[PDB]
């Protein structure tokens, strides 16, 4: 629609696309099956969102209040951009960097930014895989090593779970400033993670294609096992109702919509550019549309499936704490008044509080009672990676077959993380080949950069990258891809090739969806990001053992220097889109 003179020749002609398939059997790779492509894409998407981010934000928004906005954007801004990416990869027969080069010469930044974002998110996601496999290794003992203290003061104020995470595993320091040595047992696990990645992404899609059978199927088989056990847990269907009860109060916060926005681009693996390359290996007459719709259906479904399984365990543990809490309140009274054991129950607590008060108030006042409310136990959200290493790992210890429940849960989190890495590796390896050995150079170079997360401060370093690398950059790239396919390449041209490829054209509704709303929605999330960042002073949670109210969120502000690290991680990739565009207009 805007000036694009000489777009032809730069891009394969539709007349030549029939004659470019049978000849290009050698020098470009090919999917062994249709399912080996569909499985790979599914693995990557579900593996990238449900591995940690999705389950975190669900429980960090109280359920429904996050899912509703997430699903709204999952259809309006998700489905469009998932179809757009498959279609444009199958037409231009190039990876992410080639597609934006062919469409327009100065549109290099898009492909470059997509490679930087894919590198950055994969850097700190393989640390989470290291942490996951640490727990997996430590998950082969009848007494799970986080089930009891070694009692130590920290572990007493904290839980046998909180101590295993912050002390036994992270050895966390008080600040990002205080950065100790490379935790050695963490380095072994980091090496193990980056190694098995190399083992599965050695030749690229051929070798990964045979990995994605077990890797894309296990997470599911295990996620269904965790539903049947999930719903047998006492507190499930109290927490499920809780999940189904959203709070409009959270909805009226632009943050909930921003986090829902950024999660669409995570749950759909969009603006990483690893899906474009995947479709670039299909037949030119392969129905990407059908494929995109199927993927969108399975994604939404699996997200809701996980949310249900998470809140099941949440509800169970919350009910457990309610019943343990209320038992202690019963114990205090029964002790201070020598009541016959079991005379006071949940049925007769409050009437025996006042009764015994009247009987002996001087000998009742000294009694101390906690505010044992089940509802609060559900609204008690965990920050960071705590849903897997503090909520699930504890609930598992109060479930018979705790060790099995530990190994099943951390295998399904590895598989999910590994299938996510496959698509992240494709969005950095391919853009390098377009600009085994190269794979290995990337597998070892990154592994070396992954040492910052094996420090004592290494968990606070992870928090920044997760809050920036996987945030605004994705939205911007996501906005551009939509803009540069419709207003630079022409939606009208794009409709012709759609018909040449799938054999038909998109519904008018779906055309309009990527035509106006989806671009519009991206801009809305963009504004939301700007507002929250400016409206809130940059800070972070620390774990300082031995401070006033130790088992509380101590939320110190980052040093000035961290903000430099912040203005870079969220800046450099996005700036490559304007930056290169200007550089090409002055060359």
């Amino acid at each position: 629609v805007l000036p694009n003179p000489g777009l032809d020749a730069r891009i394969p002609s539709l007349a030549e696309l029939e004659t470019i398939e049978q000849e290009e059997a050698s020098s470009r790779p090919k999917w062994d099956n249709k399912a080996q492509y569909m499985l790979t894409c599914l693995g990557f998407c579900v593996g990238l969102g449900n591995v940690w981010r999705f389950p975190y934000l669900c429980q960090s928004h109280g359920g429904g209040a996050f899912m509703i906005p997430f699903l709204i954007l999952l259809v309006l801004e998700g489905i469009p951009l998932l179809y757009l990416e498959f279609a444009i990869g199958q037409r231009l027969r190039r990876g992410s960097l080639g597609v934006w080069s062919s469409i327009h010469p100065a549109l290099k930044g898009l492909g470059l930014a997509s490679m930087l974002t894919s590198f950055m998110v994969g850097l700190y996601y393989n640390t989470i895989i290291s942490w996951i496999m640490w727990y997996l290794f430590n998950s082969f003992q009848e007494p799970l090593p986080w089930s009891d203290c070694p009692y130590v003061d920290e572990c007493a104020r904290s839980s046998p779970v909180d101590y295993f995470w912050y002390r036994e595993t992270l050895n966390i320091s008080t600040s990002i400033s205080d950065s100790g040595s490379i935790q050695w047992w963490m380095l072994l696990c980091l090496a193990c993670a980056w190694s098995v990645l190399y083992m599965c992404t050695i030749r690229g899609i051929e070798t990964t294609g045979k990995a994605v059978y077990i890797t894309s199927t296990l997470p599911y088989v295990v996620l269904t096992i965790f539903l049947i056990r999930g719903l047998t847990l006492k507190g499930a269907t109290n927490g499920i109702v809780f999940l189904f009860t959203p709070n409009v109060t959270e909805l009226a916060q632009p943050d909930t919509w921003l986090d829902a926005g950024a999660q669409v681009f995570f749950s759909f693996s969009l603006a990483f550019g690893g899906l474009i390359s995947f479709s670039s290996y299909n037949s030119v007459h392969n129905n990407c549309e059908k494929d995109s719709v199927i993927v969108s259906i399975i994604n939404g479904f699996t997200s809701v499936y996980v949310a249900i399984v998470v809140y099941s365990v949440i509800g169970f543990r919350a009910t457990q704490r309610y019943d343990d809490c209320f038992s202690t309140n019963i114990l205090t009274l029964i002790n201070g008044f020598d009541l016959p054991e079991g005379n006071v129950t949940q049925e007769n607590f409050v009437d025996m509080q006042q009764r015994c008060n009247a009987s002996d108030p001087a000998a009742y006042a000294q009694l101390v009672f906690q505010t044992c409310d089940i509802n609060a136990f559900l609204s008690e959200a965990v920050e960071g990676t705590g849903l897997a290493f503090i909520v699930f790992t504890e609930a598992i210890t109060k479930m018979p077959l705790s060790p099995l429940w530990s190994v099943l849960f951390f295998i399904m989190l590895f598989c999910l993380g590994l299938s996510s890495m496959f698509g992240n590796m494709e969005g950095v390896v391919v853009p390098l080949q377009d600009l085994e050995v190269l794979t290995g150079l990337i597998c070892l170079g990154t592994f070396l950069i992954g040492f910052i997360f094996t420090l004592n401060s290494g968990q606070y370093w992870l928090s920044l990258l997760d809050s920036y690398a996987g945030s605004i950059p994705l939205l911007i790239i996501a906005f551009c891809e939509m803009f540069s396919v419709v207003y630079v390449y022409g939606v009208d041209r794009f409709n012709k090739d759609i018909e040449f490829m799938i054999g038909h054209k998109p519904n008018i509704f779906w055309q309009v969806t990527w035509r106006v709303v989806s671009p519009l929605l991206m801009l809305i999330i963009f504004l939301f990001f700007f507002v929250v960042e400016v409206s809130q002073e940059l800070t972070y949670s620390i774990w300082d053992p031995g401070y006033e109210e130790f088992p509380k969120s101590q939320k110190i502000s980052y040093p000035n220097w961290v903000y430099v690290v912040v203005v870079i991680v969220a800046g450099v990739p996005s700036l490559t889109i304007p930056g290169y565009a200007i550089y090409k207009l002055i060359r």
Binding site: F137, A191, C192, M199, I202, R203
Partner: peptide, 29 residues
């Protein structure tokens, strides 16, 4: 250590896999 011994086993099989895979490529001629 249980975690160490499991780690060792996993590493071994993974690196052996890698070695076999790279050698398999060498075999491909």
């Amino acid at each position: 250590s249980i975690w160490l011994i499991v780690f060792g086993v996993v590493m071994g099989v993974i690196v052996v896999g890698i070695v076999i895979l790279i050698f398999t490529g060498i075999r491909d001629r």
